[PDB]
């Protein structure tokens, strides 16, 4: 019921950066630079611009001081300058509020379009960006926990099929999803760049930003982040993991920044660039779907997420999911999960694993 | 309370092997050989003798068919044949039951002494053992989850200070322990070979065997064991982990064999061979003591453990711990743990960490 | 001098598979299945079809028994069935010999076009392929040296700029290259799928196939391949490495199969999918350009490569390189290389790095 | 030829530290601290005291400014204060020169004995040492290339059996060695702490110090050291490696400090603490004995090593090896090596492996 525009979709290359509003810039800096080791592309007293080890565009993350912590923009790079015009015509046809700035919203981005998308998320589309030193061989700077690329976003929205069709029309291809036999969709993963995803939809009250994910080269780099957080006596900011995912097959960790923005560290998913890439559907009751090793998913992972802003910088009103809750059907009083389909041995009932 | 003998202690080198009684030899073989990739030194219809990738002695694990799953013997190798005579005299002086066989209790071990020790555990001391092909460079056999050495045992016993003193007289050096501010000791780790431990004491009803631990080379080898168990749809046999330990600083995993015998996979602890190796004491309420990342310890890890047999093959009676329970004081209804000492933020009241 | 056709280029997704002719199918099976752990999708007395751990198309490697070991086809998957028609019209405009088979040349591929390309290489274009079980979570099968994807081909050709221009018109984008200060190009890397490359051109007498490359997840997986070859006492089949590449930044190893076909194992290069991805040009005398740690490149790496076949199955005639030789200008008696540009300290004159001369 | 004393040998725990004389303290600091990431326990204008990630004694490496770069002392820790007295009586009975300092030779060491041992090496024995913060869980400091322990020394001496017997009488057990079928020993490895070695003897002119070795946790840590040296454009200081050893089975790398002192990075050898630990003998012509993958050993590895000092601080005179040279018999012009014993295929005659010859 989000209508497909007659205007052609912009050609989206990949997720590129997120602008997060933070309440204490210095404490956010400590987390993203001193703990996590992201690289400074620019900073002043209002903003810090950060990039990953292998990036050549200006930044992957912008931290902006503001009164209420929230996602301000999730940005996708498009293939040509003309694609920003296409994005503008496309969202205007969808009836969405748009704002175009020929010189960008943040430093190091040129001509850019921000929109309040049909799911209430602040999307940005741009092509032009200031190139910086690509640090991919700067092993003199490489951290034991080095974050090497921006991998994806993950959005909480109440109606997953409705959002999925809209992103499919935008050219995103679904690689994996979670469903049940009654026909409810709980989550979907979709891509442009030929990894498992550039964004994903998690069923829940929204719009809220569930997480931003960075990749590492190897699994030991993720381990090191946990080990460092232990040494810094901030292990209470490790929310979930480390683990192996079922969906995506990636090794992963979820941690919480000082404003409780959730960051995923992620590595070693698989190639999805062929247009007939096989789509994998998991049953919501399969206890290996989210953590392959069957470790339980903490309730906060399902219930907590970041606010998102509209184009005026005000928090978007939240719409409550009416479809079945993944939390309730798996770990709630009436929920259940299995290790082996149809086997009570290794099943969990009204209880997590 | 357990007196120090006048007789000299045997010079113990290291933990060497465990004999575990198992109820179904085929299912146990499938776990230890097919799932975990241990190497068969010998087998027949009653027993399977298994060794790790870098071992040269006959075995690190003997699976013996029997009617009740249990630990039958935890064996330590001693430095010389005369040390087996010393062990016998030492345990005689302690008034323990002993049994000595010049040709061994299990295949590939020679002159051996088994004892019912003062804590009710079946200990074996031996020197003589049949050498086998050391597979340490057999990369044609190397598994992505390869188990490379036997590292330690861990014993459940009701009174940790009492056991600790006895193990110290026997020559084990305590490297780390867990205590509280009220005089209670909850666990201790102690060594002969220059790693964090060869055995360890966990406070609880006992004697029971908490686990046997094998090492891997690298952390990714432990991750692969988890990944393989997922692919085999036996992830319900992963009990706890993977994680980083606080105590020992080792990367770890606990899994359960077909008879619920607990196996730890362990890697990358530190050198303890100097005699003034600094001893580390953790507070029982420190939520980074067991898992450094603050992940919760499932109650089964505290409550479940394997039976142990006496020298007649009968199960040892269980004596209940009267000291405070590590489970109850940390994750029970009146339990408590902290992330930072004295900080309410990141503390847990009456429940386990991580929500 | 290869002109840009008026006909549209086919939309190529990625490299997909190679067909290698092998002389002893059993010995080749031992290497690829028993030593390297590739997964069999089909086999019989004549061919063995193999795939990597994360693949869903039918195969990444076909071993075909034949009298003369050679590359028979390097295959690229195209985006749609109609792109096979575009490939056909494109190479016909180029004046190249083509052959179309609606039911494929090898099992598990459908409608396919093979061509003798302007550099003399047998390229295949196809869309249709038989899907197989994607083994990406089959950790019960996973080996300590697991090969997880097909990454690229590497082609030996005498005139690199000529070939580079042709591949650019086909839609490949150059990511890295090696040149000198007086305008000679020694090598170029170029991509479709958003890694450093799907194919690459190495200056030398050609056409010859330099190597086929497979990926691993981690660097330790590459180390294990070496360790296993030592245990199997075939360490003489380790040609070069393991190392860190300069060009591509990937961890690597080169090994030789029973017919001397060269296989590279490769991991952890970077993303190139943005259309203004910065190109990187290295100086040929930079001793960190091929091995970042400065380890010497063995001369066989420069001189030895596989024969390639035409569409009749006959060996393509070799044409000699007339531009300067990378081997000669870096490690030959009149060559040189440097660690730091302009610094005599850490420079090597008339010999390779680390203290060896050429055998 | 070196008699076993009647006096009892001191009980040696392990290698503990080396004192190296360096010519430019700031340049040496840049290598050991900025490049390699060792942790500073103390420094002033004359010395730098350094320790590894998991150490609790004061240091593993003392860098001492002086006019001539050299090993000044290889230090072993003993089990008790009374073992220092035993060391003094033991070496006095061997007829060696000894010097005892109740408050140490270097800061953070207490009562210490230095000796000119029968092979001309400056050994120190001590028990007392200042404990420092053990940084084994300080993951806030941990480097991608972190050196976690001091593992061993390696000594160049002309007569290996002569030195091996003396070290055996001192309590070291030989774990592996290299010999040929004609009675020559080329190298021996020997331990106290239950790893492959605490010291080792390499046949050549001596006394000279071949290297000091530090361990890492994982193989990727050694890879990162290489990668960092590339990024710092000091790849010319990577001498040999990275590799898998045959002898010791450890993953390894050799690098060269500013005064050319050789440092090995090392990981994942095996347990040797049992008294009947099987002793492994490799043949000197086995091309997998030093590098398991068959990579050639550069001539500098055989010919270059650090000077060692006597107790007066003067350089020890070098005695020439008369036994056969490992270089000459393996990679020399009349050399030979094999991949598979008894197989001509994969054998090397008068040259090194993998296409190289002596520079
Ligand atoms: Ca001979
Ligand atoms: Cl998940
Ligand atoms: Cl624990
Ligand atoms: Cl290269
Ligand atoms: Cl060596
Ligand atoms: Co995610
Ligand atoms: Co344990
Ligand atoms: Co290549
Ligand atoms: Co060494």
């Amino acid at each position: 019921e989000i209508p497909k525009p007659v205007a052609p979709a912009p050609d989206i290359l990949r997720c590129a950066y997120a602008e997060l509003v933070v309440t204490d810039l210095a404490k956010s800096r400590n987390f993203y630079v001193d703990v996590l080791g992201l690289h400074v592309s620019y900073e002043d007293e209002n903003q810090i611009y950060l990039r990953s080890f292998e990036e050549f565009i200006h930044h992957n993350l912008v931290l902006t001081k503001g009164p209420v912590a929230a996602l301000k923009a999730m940005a996708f790079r498009v293939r040509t300058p003309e694609d920003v015009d296409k994005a503008e015509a496309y969202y205007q046809e969808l009836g969405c509020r748009t704002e175009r700035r020929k010189d960008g919203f943040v430093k190091g981005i040129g001509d850019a379009l921000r929109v309040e998308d049909p799911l209430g998320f602040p999307y940005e589309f741009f092509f032009e960006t200031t190139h910086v030193e690509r640090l991919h061989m700067r092993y003199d700077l490489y951290s034991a926990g080095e974050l090497v690329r921006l991998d994806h976003f993950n959005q909480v929205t109440p109606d997953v099929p409705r959002g999925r069709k809209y992103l499919e029309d935008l050219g995103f291809r679904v690689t994996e999803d979670i469903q049940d036999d009654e026909g409810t969709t709980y989550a979907a993963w979709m891509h442009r760049k030929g990894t498992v995803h550039d964004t994903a939809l998690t069923g829940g009250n929204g719009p809220r930003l569930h997480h931003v994910a960075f990749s590492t080269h190897e699994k030991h780099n993720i381990i090191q982040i946990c080990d460092k957080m232990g040494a810094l006596r901030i292990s209470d900011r490790i929310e979930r993991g480390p683990g192996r995912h079922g969906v995506s097959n990636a090794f992963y960790l979820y941690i919480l920044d000082p404003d409780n923005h959730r960051i995923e560290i992620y590595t070693q998913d698989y190639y999805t660039g062929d247009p007939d890439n096989p789509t994998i559907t998991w049953n919501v009751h399969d206890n290996q779907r989210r953590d392959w090793w069957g470790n339980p998913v903490v309730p906060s992972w399902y219930t907590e997420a970041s606010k998102v802003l509209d184009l005026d910088g005000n928090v978007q009103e939240i719409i409550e999911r009416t479809d079945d809750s993944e939390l309730e059907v798996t770990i709630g009083a009436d929920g259940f999960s299995f290790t082996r389909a149809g086997d009570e041995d290794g099943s969990y009932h009204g209880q997590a694993s």
Side-chain angles (χ1 to χ4, degrees), chain A:
Chain A
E1 95 174 347
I2 298 167
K4 190 184 182 175
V6 75
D11 181 351
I12 293 157
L13 297 164
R14 52 162 177 144
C15 63
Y17 77 94
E19 181 183 7
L20 298 181
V21 183
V22 304
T23 53
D24 185 320
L25 195 62
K27 295 196 180 182
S28 300
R29 190 188 194 286
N30 299 337
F31 183 80
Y32 288 99
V33 180
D34 296 331
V35 179
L36 294 181
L38 287 168
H39 302 275
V40 180
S41 299
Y42 183 73
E43 74 185 300
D44 62 17
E45 33 282 309
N46 303 310
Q47 297 181 305
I48 303 165
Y49 290 75
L50 300 173
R51 75 182 185 270
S52 63
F53 194 62
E54 298 189 341
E55 187 53 84
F56 72 92
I57 74 167
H58 186 260
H59 56 261
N60 296 129
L61 186 61
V62 181
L63 308 173
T64 300
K65 189 184 169 197
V68 176
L71 174 75
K72 192 168 189 188
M74 42 197 302
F76 298 93
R77 195 171 190 213
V78 301
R79 186 170 292 281
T80 66
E82 314 91 78
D83 285 293
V84 182
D85 284 343
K86 291 194 216 135
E88 198 177 19
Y90 194 91
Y91 282 96
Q92 278 174 180
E93 185 176 352
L94 290 173
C96 294
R97 193 171 167 206
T98 69
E99 182 180 357
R100 179 98 177 242
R101 289 192 189 189
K102 287 279 156 55
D103 290 297
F105 288 83
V106 298
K107 290 181 172 48
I109 304 294
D111 183 29
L113 181 76
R114 286 184 179 193
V115 307
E116 301 168 358
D117 97 340
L119 307 178
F121 288 90
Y123 272 19
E124 180 177 282
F125 301 95
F126 72 92
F127 169 78
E128 301 174 344
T129 182
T130 303
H131 292 197
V132 294
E133 182 189 352
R134 193 174 205 163
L135 305 169
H136 69 298
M137 313 191 70
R138 295 296 306 279
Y139 293 106
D140 57 318
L141 308 179
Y142 192 74
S143 167
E146 195 66 35
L147 305 178
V148 298
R149 308 178 196 198
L150 175 76
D151 190 78
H152 64 264
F153 312 125
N154 187 305
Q155 301 171 229
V156 191
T157 197
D159 188 331
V160 179
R162 172 169 186 272
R164 164 201 193 125
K165 182 213 166 69
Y166 149 75
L167 295 171
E168 283 174 335
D169 291 344
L170 258 177
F172 287 83
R173 298 175 245 163
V174 174
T175 49
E176 302 209 36
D177 67 10
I178 296 169
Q179 292 182 30
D180 64 13
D181 288 356
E182 172 175 296
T184 301
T185 302
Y186 296 93
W189 284 253
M190 55 272 288
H191 87 98
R192 292 291 296 171
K193 73 183 180 306
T195 70
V196 167
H197 62 313
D198 286 286
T199 199
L201 300 182
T202 297
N205 308 334
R208 287 184 303 156
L209 176 72
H210 194 285
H211 57 271
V212 179
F214 289 87
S215 64
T216 62
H217 289 306
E218 300 198 343
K219 293 177 281 283
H220 60 85
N221 302 109
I222 292 173
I223 288 170
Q224 160 63 17
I225 292 171
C226 301
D227 286 334
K228 184 171 185 188
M229 288 174 81
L232 292 174
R233 284 275 174 180
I234 62 179
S235 59
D236 57 328
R237 310 307 291 169
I238 298 177
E239 187 192 32
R240 165 167 172 230
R244 170 73 70 179
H245 278 309
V247 173
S248 85
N249 192 44
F251 197 87
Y252 74 89
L253 173 70
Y254 300 91
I255 64 182
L256 304 177
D257 92 349
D259 293 288
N260 278 73
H261 298 311
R262 183 187 288 105
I263 307 297
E264 184 181 6
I265 326 295
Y266 181 95
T267 194
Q268 292 158 37
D269 69 345
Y270 58 87
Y271 169 81
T272 62
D274 286 13
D276 64 347
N277 181 71
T279 306
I280 306 170
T281 294
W282 300 71
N283 188 273
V284 75
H285 300 291
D286 183 339
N287 190 52
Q288 302 185 181
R289 73 195 184 287
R290 286 206 171 274
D291 191 84
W292 180 236
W293 307 333
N295 283 328
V297 183
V298 72
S300 77
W301 198 90
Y302 293 119
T303 65
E304 309 306 298
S306 299
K307 293 169 192 173
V308 313
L309 306 186
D310 73 15
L311 265 15
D312 304 307
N314 297 324
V315 178
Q316 283 282 10
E317 52 265 58
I318 282 160
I319 298 77
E320 329 267 279
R321 176 174 177 84
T322 56
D323 286 344
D324 291 354
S325 158
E326 182 162 10
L327 184 166
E328 294 289 352
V329 304
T330 63
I331 64 178
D334 304 317
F336 78 92
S337 70
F338 63 76
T339 300
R340 295 162 293 278
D343 187 3
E344 278 297 316
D345 189 30
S347 284
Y348 306 107
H349 291 274
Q351 199 165 34
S353 64

